[PDB]
Amino acid sequence: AVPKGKRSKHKCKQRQLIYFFDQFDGVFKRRRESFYRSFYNPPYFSKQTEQTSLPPSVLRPFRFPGFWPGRFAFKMAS
Amino acid sequence: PNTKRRIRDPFWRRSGWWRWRQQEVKAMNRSRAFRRHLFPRFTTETVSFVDAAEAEAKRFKEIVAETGRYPGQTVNFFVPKVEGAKLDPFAALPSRQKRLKLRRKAVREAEEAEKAREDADFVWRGKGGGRVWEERKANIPLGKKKLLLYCTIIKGLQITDAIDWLSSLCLHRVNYLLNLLNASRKKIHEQGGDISRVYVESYMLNIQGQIKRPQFRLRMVNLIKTWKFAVVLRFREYPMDEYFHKLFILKHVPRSLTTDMRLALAGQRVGLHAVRDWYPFLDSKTRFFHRKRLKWLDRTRQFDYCLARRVFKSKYEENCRRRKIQVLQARGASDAVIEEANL
Amino acid sequence: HTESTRRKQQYASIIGKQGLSKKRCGIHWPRYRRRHKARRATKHKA
Amino acid sequence: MQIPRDVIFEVVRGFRGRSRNCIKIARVRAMKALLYSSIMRRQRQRRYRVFWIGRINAAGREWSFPYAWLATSLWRQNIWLDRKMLANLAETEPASFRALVNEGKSVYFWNPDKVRDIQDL
RNA sequence: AACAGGUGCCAGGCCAACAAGAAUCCGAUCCGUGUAUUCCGUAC
RNA sequence: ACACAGUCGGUACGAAGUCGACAAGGUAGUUGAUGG
RNA sequence: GGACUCCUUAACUUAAACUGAGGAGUCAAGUAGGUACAAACCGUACAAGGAUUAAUUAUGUCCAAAAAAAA
RNA sequence: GAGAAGGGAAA
RNA sequence: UGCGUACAUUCCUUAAUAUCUGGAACGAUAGAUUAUGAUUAGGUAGUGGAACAAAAAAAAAAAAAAAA
RNA sequence: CCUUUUAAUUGAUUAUGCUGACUUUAGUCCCGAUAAACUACAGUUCUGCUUAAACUGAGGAGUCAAGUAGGUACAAACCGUACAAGGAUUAAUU
RNA sequence: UCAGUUAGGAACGAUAGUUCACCGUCAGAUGUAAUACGUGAGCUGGGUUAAGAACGUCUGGAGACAGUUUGUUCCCUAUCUACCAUUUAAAAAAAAAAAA
RNA sequence: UGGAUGCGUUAAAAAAAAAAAAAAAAAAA
Q1: Does C15 reach chain B within 8 Å, measured CB to CB?
Q2: Which secondary-structure segment (H or E) carries B205?
Q3: What span is annotated as the signal peptide, if there is one (chain D) (predicted)?
Q4: Do the strands B198-216 and B221-237 form a parallel or antiparallel pair, or are they unpaired?
Q5: What is the DSSP string of B229-265?
Q6: Which end of chain B has fewer beta carbons closer than 10 Å to its terminal beta carbon, N or C?
Q7: C-beta atoms surrounding B157 within 10 Å
Q8: CA-based R_g, chain A, Å
Q9: CB distance A18–B169 less than 8 Å?
């Protein structure tokens, strides 16, 4: 069995939107939610990337300085 | 997965999504969205953004069309472009990137000028404005159909939100878009733009081609294609007034910012005052109830849009200035150096 | 066809203007030069 | 070609999909559009005329003088206002239309030579 | 006007070892072998 | 779009005012035509 | 070496948009109207072109749908 | 008042 | 005793090329186009007339009003 | 420009036309046979199949192909690689 | 025979490519017709209508028979209509900035 | 300590019934 005609641009656009919503609500929202929940734990440190990665760390940066009420850096010692 | 999750369909609904229903529902949605706005009840002026380079190009081309001559020509005439011509008839005009550079220059100049204008705190400016960057990446081995998904995800989001989005997807070929976003953010920061208020305003996909390979089958030989595409992203630094009206009044706050606030509170990296400090932006419930409180205060005429905007802008600017001063002090710099850094 | 129509329109747009240059004329440069030579032809020995 | 290419592309402006820019489909669509225009421009006169006729009939029936009697009366009276004018007077000049109806009645409702009073016999 | 080549593109007189104009005026943004006017060389 | 997806037509401002406006009113800027 | 309607016929099961003859009309190569809906029936003061005037053609006059029932 | 035998439904 | 309904070379604008439409007429330095002149102008096959098809070549791109 | 000419072989919605580009089918079909761990105080995961001796006086029982198919950094590069006396009697030097 | 507000139902085999039939059992309720003699992009391939080969028959022959036989690749990932399943919503993606 | 199926068991009643997905004097969202 084969198509009897060419699918139109209008219907292809409709399909684009429908598949976008399907993939969004089926994969992308869930993956983003899991990613944002993982932030409450120290970032994963792969032992196979030791040779080139940074030393292990736990701190997660606050990336909007305009909303930070505390101190940004400590004065140089002497 | 949940196996009972509600997956959305933009064209059909059980409740009835015929065209008349869509019309009525979207009229309701437009009304609600407009009523979500709080507007100042007193302003001195209604300044609107204009692009001098675009206006000059428009007038230049209008003159060329109306007189058949370049502006200032008296003897010769305008010569349109023909096949094989190596001269651009509109070479005197700036390119799109040059116009963007001139826009950034004008924005900087107007920002500096506004700091010495009386009544600058009572002026309405509107949505548009601010600096704009256009960044392009080529040779992406992805097709239009997938790029449309990945760009519809991030359109309209703050840059860090978009980066988090695309990083959460665990897709190998989205590394191209992630590289573009990271490089653009680094470039804007180095040029002095405030990463905190840079949004992805629009995208554009430009095909480049497709490499074809034979695929030998039972009765025929096919050609399988690998795409070649380029992506152009438009980043915009929102002016401080627009940033205030978006985050504070309409409660459209970056989830990256909200997550950082919640992580700080959970880890006790800030004081107890931070809870009330960040109440207007912290969570959905706090944002909703603060919006209700602001609406009631505005309807009783106790809320002051201009005073609130000034307080928000001053707090933001002072936090940034403190960051700069303390990072300088962490180096052991001299008082003269620190003072000269502020000029 | 479309190519011939486009070429004729471009030639009609450029051919009637004096003082053009090679970069302005492109593929029509020899034709434009011959046309201007023919137009000059009447000035010889006045 | 049956129609010039430029005219085809100018006529298919506002159409749906490939009909706007593909010559093969635009030609068929433009042919049909202009043929419809040609036929309907010849046909529309009587479609307007029936509208005038219905308007006049309703206006006359409002005064108890149907269109048939009104038309006979006017034509007999040597009043040659056309249907469009009569409909316009009906919808915009009610007093003048009522005067026309009264004139038509004065001719239609003639009286016999002898009239009989039989109310008390 | 085939009084060839080159010189930023259409040059008899800028170069090209043997003739003759850095000729003048006008050119949106650079240049002009271009327009207009004019002088000169040529048994080329 | 009900549509070989086109064609012919297609909304008639203000009074949204008011210190308004022939014969009666029972004063509503209301009313006059109509007994078997 | 065309089609259908009509008139007159031969063949057929007094059958077939059957086959085959003699004459007119339409189609073929003729739009828009009527006949419910893709040629051949009716009708045309038959279509160069434009327009918001008019006419009793066929045929209609309860509604779909234009068009009579004063006192 | 009729293959009014397109649908409704009329003296 | 009525009326509805298709048809305008009524108005306005074009066209007529196998020797007969006035025209064997009126003009004439190369036809301006007929105002109550006529016939008229659906059309497959076939036949015929006309107008285009932006180019090239040619030894004819300044005796042209007013302004410059 | 106009005029005259042109032998241009001069007008393409159509030949399952030719040479190509780019859409629809569609983000659909297509994913070959068994796999784990590499460790906060020792070790030996499980499975399929069984010529895996490489001097012992013996070139180690073949032919053919790879126009160099198991060299080399998580390389579809660069560089290097078939020695018939096998060169290191290198039990040396340190 | 006529009549419905049409209500519930009518089993299996031998030979046979068979349909319609014949014969046997159960039952004691022949049913008939249409749906492209419904249905092969749903199945089979026994008969039947290719290449091989054989018998009878016809010709001088190659060959043949509305005579009989044996052997002989039954494709398609479903675009649309139809149907059976199936579906949060006003919002819980993005955007929707007025008045002057 | 259990699951599925029929070769097991039960019912063959209701149709204004069992049940459902859009409360509706809201006539220009």
Answers
A1: no
A2: strand B198-216
A3: none
A4: antiparallel
A5: EEEEEEEEE--HHHHHIIIIIS----HHHHHHHHHHH
A6: C
A7: 18
A8: 24
A9: no
Chain D 47-66, CB < 7 Å to strand G? 48-50, 53-54, 57-58, 64, 66
Q: How far apart are CA B168 and CA B174, in angstroms?
A: 10
Task: For strands B198-216 and B132-140, give the pairing.
Answer: unpaired
Q: Please report residues of B whose CB lies closer than 8 A to that of A30.
A: 1
User: Resolution, rounded to a tenth of an Å?
Assistant: 2.2
- Bases in strand G with any atom closer than 7 Å to a protein CB: 31-32, 50-54, 66-70
Q: Residue B292 to residues B37, B165, B284: CA-CA distances in angstroms?
A: 12, 30, 12
**Min Cα separation B92/chain C (Å):** 15
Contact (CB, 8 A) for D73 and D108: yes
Token pair recorded at residue B20: 């008349």
Residue B109 sits at the vertex; the CA angle it makes with B107 and B114, to the nearest 5 degrees, is 95
Report the alpha-carbon distance of residue B229 to residue B26 in Å, rounded: 35
Closest residue by Cα to residue B103 from B50, B163, B65: B50
Provide the token pair at A15: 């399909």
Neighbouring chains of D at 3+ CB pairs under 8 Å are A
Tokens of D80: 């040659």
**Between the CA of residue B20 and those of A76, B10, B25, B52, B208, what are the distances in Å?**
68, 15, 9, 43, 42
Nucleotide nearest to D31 (CA to C1'): F6
Which chain A residues have a beta carbon less than 8 Å from that of B167? Answer: 35
- Nucleotides in chain F with any atom closer than 7 Å to protein CB: 1, 4-9
Structure-solving method: cryo-EM
**CB–CB contact A64 B330 (8 Å):** no
B3: left (phi over 0), alpha (psi -120 to 50) or beta: left
Are B135 and B180 in contact, with CB atoms under 8 Å apart?
yes
D94 phi, psi to nearest 5 deg: -60, -35
Check if A10 contacts D (Cβ < 8 Å).
yes
- Residue B20 backbone class (left: φ over 0; alpha: ψ -120 to 50; beta: rest): alpha
The closest alpha carbon to D29, from D15, D40, D39, belongs to: D15
Contact at CB, B86 and C17, closer than 8 angstroms: no
Q: Is B134 helix (H, G, I), strand (E, B) or coil?
A: strand
Residues in chain B, how many?
343
For chains A and C, having 3+ Cβ pairs within 8 Å is answered no
Q: Which residue has the tokens 């069309």?
A: B65
